[PDB]
Amino acid sequence: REEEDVICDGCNGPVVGTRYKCSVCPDYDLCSVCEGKGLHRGHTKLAFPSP
Ligand SMILES: [Zn+2]
Ligand SMILES: [Zn+2]
């Protein structure tokens, strides 16, 4: 089967739990580790579940 997964654009790891999606850049997401490290603070991000 084909599945749609979310990959972190900061570290290339899986994004599980909460994803931090850029509201400006196309198709851009951070994992909680990279979000906590302060990546991509120059744009507003949307925080919502990444099941
Ligand atoms: Zn990451
Ligand atoms: Zn952005």
Numbering used by the authors: -3 to 47
Study text:
In an effort to elucidate the manner by which the ZZ-domain of p62 recognizes N-terminal arginylated BiP/GRP78 (hereafter referred to as R-BiP), we generated the chimeric protein N-terminal R-BiP (R*-E19b-E20b-E21b-D22b; where “*” and subscript “b” represent attachment to the modified N-terminus and BiP residues, respectively) fused to the ZZ-domain using a special expression system. Using this fusion protein, we determined the complex structure of the ZZ-domain with R-BiP substrate at 1.45 Å resolution. As expected, the binding site of the ZZ-domain comprises a negatively charged patch for recognition of the positively charged N-terminal NH3+ group of R-BiP. The side chains of Asp129 and Asp149 in the ZZ-domain form hydrogen bonds with the α-amino group of R-BiP. Moreover, the key carboxylate of Asp129 which is involved in recognizing the α-amino group also forms an ionic interaction with the guanidinium group of the N-terminal arginine residue. Another negatively charged residue, Asp147, also participates in the N-degron binding, and in a manner that is not sequence-specific. The side chain carboxylate of Asp147 interacts with the main chain nitrogen atom of the first peptide bond between the first arginine R* and Glu19b of the N-degron. The main chain nitrogen atom of Ile127 also forms a hydrogen bond with the carbonyl oxygen of the first peptide bond of the N-degron. However, the side chain of Asn132 is re-oriented to form a specific interaction with the side chain of the N-degron. It is rotated 72.3° and moved by approximately 3.0 Å to facilitate recognition of the guanidinium group of the N-terminal arginine.
Intriguingly, the autophagy adapter p62/SQSTM1/Sequestosome-1 was recently reported to recognize N-degrons, the N-end rule substrates of the well-characterized UPS, and where ultimately these substrates are delivered to ALS8,9. p62 is a key selective autophagy adapter that plays a role in the degradation of various cellular constituents such as misfolded proteins and their aggregates, malfunctioning organelles, and invading pathogens. Intriguingly, it was recently reported that the central ZZ-domain in p62 plays a critical role in the recognition of N-terminal arginylated BiP/GRP78 by the Arg-tRNA transferase ATE1. Here, we present the high resolution structures of the ZZ-domain of p62 in complex with 8 different N-degrons including type-1 and type-2, and subsequently identify key determinants involved in the unusual recognition.
